[PDB]
Write a protein that binds this ligand. Structure first.
Ligand code: ZN
Lengths: 29, 233, 75, 265
């Protein structure tokens, strides 16, 4: 029901932020 | 042909991508069961379009290996540990024929030593335990002894018997009603009518024993053993 | 015709398959990586052509300065 | 855990759904030709004709072995990889401390052509070599059957008798004690020395030790398999120099150490 590894969740969020930031960086440059 | 092989290859690219995606989805949920070493053995395995065609009445043991273009007729049986490889040419097994445990029925892997001969097994044929048939033909109602080796081009005529442990050299034609044995196989004696009766009665009995074995293997997999293996500590 | 994007995508595809072959793996072992490599090759080729144009533009100005300094000697 | 954990769980569910849909689409493009791999239906121990194999507690049966029907296996015995002990039409008995090596077939006969049809009897501390064929015969205690040998119905191998590798022993042949037979057909070769009797006994005793490590490995669960895979990776190499700089000594965990009775020394 829930993923419990909090470090893994933080890393997943960091990877998502990296991807979305790269997309926005390209789109606004 | 070439188009089918290209489509088969491109399908593997899409499948490998999908399976990797599924693994990513499990890793996000903290599941690692995809890492379990489970047996990839297939009783019936295809080599691209070459797939085994097996009669609905023919018993095949789950641990047997049937690879490529392999035809099994009605009432026939493939017992435990048997290997049948039909890639470079076809393997055909007639009706009412028993291939006993740990037998190997295969064709040549390469055409370096000549054109690759197929393997033909007739009807009501008995192949004894751990026999090796390589690119030969076996006619209807013949007896191949346990541990015998038949090389390529060998013809075993109807009602002919290869003794146990006999090495039949390449292109050796066994005439009807003859017992051949030894290394290399040579004529030993003439077959008797009682032996012919025992051959037929044995193949009929093996078809009935195979029916029994095909029923007990069909039993639903025990969930108790599954739970016992899951909960080991 | 033959553009920087096409050449770069082909070179990215070639690199991934060359990398797979150097490791004795099948050519199309991880096809999403082939897609990534084609994208990266196209990006790199377009950037390289743009950078070459900029470099030539800068070199022209610097050679102008060099020639002016050298022509100062004959005054 | 929490809201973020649930969100990532739902996203992973979507990702798995997409992955399986892509797998199906690829399978369709393959032309439905590839036969799918399935859950294993091999039964190591199987009943037939309401007969159940009777296997002692400390017997190594390889998972790939097929023990079928009315088969009895005694203490300390070992059934190796690919072995088929089909006791369906008659009884198969295996004594204590007896090894049946890889890819062996043991079968019986309901009725032989002539004489009295008997079950397959294998005694104690008997070695049966790789890929042997044992059909309706009797092997008494402390006997040796070489690899690739074929024993037909009615064959009797006596105590301290040896069948050489590759031998075809004809029906109703008797191998006397202290003798080694061989060939196709098998025939008397020579007498067995005392060192060879010692060899036979040491063979059975070595295989009881080998059976233990194989039985231990084959019965490990998924979790233990993964733990030991990680351990094996962690201890595959060493940097004892940096350990000495750190002032530590790395020791091999006990789960990775084999018992002394199986080591060459
Ligand atoms: Zn049999």
């Amino acid at each position: 029901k829930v993923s419990e590894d909090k470090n893994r969740n933080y890393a997943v969020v960091a990877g998502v932020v990296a991807i979305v930031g790269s997309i926005g960086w390209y789109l606004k440059a | 042909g070439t188009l089918g092989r290209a489509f088969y290859s491109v399908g593997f690219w899409i499948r490998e991508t999908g399976q990797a995606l599924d693994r990513l989805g499990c890793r996000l949920q903290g599941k690692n069961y995809f890492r379990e070493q489970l047996s990839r053995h297939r009783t019936l395995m295809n080599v691209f379009d070459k797939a085994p065609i097996v009669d609905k009445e023919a018993f095949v043991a789950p641990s047997a290996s049937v690879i490529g273009d392999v035809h099994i007729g009605r009432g026939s049986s493939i017992w435990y540990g048997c290997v049948l490889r039909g890639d470079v040419n076809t393997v055909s097994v007639g009706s009412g024929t028993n291939i006993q445990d740990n037998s190997l029925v295969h064709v040549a892997k390469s055409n370096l030593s000549g054109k690759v001969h197929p393997t033909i097994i007739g009807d009501n044929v008995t192949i004894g335990h751990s026999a090796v048939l390589h690119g030969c033909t076996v006619e209807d109602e013949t007896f191949i002894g346990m541990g015998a080796t038949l090389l390529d081009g060998v013809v075993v005529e109807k009602h002919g018997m290869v003794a146990a442990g006999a090495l039949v050299r390449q292109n050796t034609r066994i005439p009807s009603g003859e017992v051949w044995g030894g290394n290399p196989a040579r004529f030993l004696r003439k077959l008797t009518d009682e032996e012919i009766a025992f051959i037929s009665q044995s193949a009929t009995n093996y078809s009935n024993l195979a029916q029994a074995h095909a029923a007990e293997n069909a039993k639903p997999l025990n969930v108790i053993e599954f739970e016992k293996v899951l909960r080991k500590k | 015709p033959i553009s920087a994007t096409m050449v770069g995508a082909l070179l990215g595809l070639g690199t991934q398959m060359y990398s797979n072959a150097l490791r004795k793996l099948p050519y199309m072992r991880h096809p999403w990586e082939h897609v990534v490599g084609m994208g990266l090759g196209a990006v790199f080729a377009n950037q390289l052509v743009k950078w070459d144009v900029k470099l030539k533009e800068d070199l022209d100005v610097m050679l102008a300065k060099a020639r002016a300094a050298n022509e100062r000697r004959y005054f | 855990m929490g809201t973020l954990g649930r969100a990532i769980y739902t996203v992973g569910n979507w990702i798995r759904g997409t992955g399986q849909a892509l797998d199906r689409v690829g399978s369709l493009l393959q032309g439905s030709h590839r036969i799918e791999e399935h859950l294993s239906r091999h039964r190591t121990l199987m009943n037939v004709f309401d007969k159940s194999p009777l296997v002692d507690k400390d017997v190594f049966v390889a998972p790939s072995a097929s023990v079928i029907g009315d088969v009895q296996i005694g203490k300390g015995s070992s059934i190796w990889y690919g072995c088929v002990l089909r006791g369906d039409v008659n009884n198969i008995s295996v004594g204590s401390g007896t090894n049946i090596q890889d890819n062996t077939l043991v079968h019986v006969a309901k009725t032989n052509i002539s004489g009295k049809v008997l079950p397959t009897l294998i005694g104690d501390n008997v070695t049966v070599g790789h890929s042997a064929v044992i059909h309706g015969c009797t092997v008494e205690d402390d006997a040796f059957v070489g690899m690739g040998a074929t024993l037909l119905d009615g064959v009797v191998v006596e105590k301290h008798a040896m069948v050489a590798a590759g031998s075809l022993v004809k029906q109703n042949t008797r191998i006397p004690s202290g003798e080694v037979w061989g060939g196709n057909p098998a025939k008397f070769m020579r007498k067995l020395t005392d060192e060879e009797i010692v060899y036979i006994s040491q063979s059975a005793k070595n295989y009881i030790n080998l059976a233990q490590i194989h039985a231990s490995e084959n019965s490990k669960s998924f979790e233990q398999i993964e733990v030991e895979r990680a351990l094996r990776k962690k201890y595959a190499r060493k940097d004892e120099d940096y350990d000495s700089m750190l002032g530590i000594t790395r020791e091999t965990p006990p789960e990775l150490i084999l018992p002394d009775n199986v080591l060459p020394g």
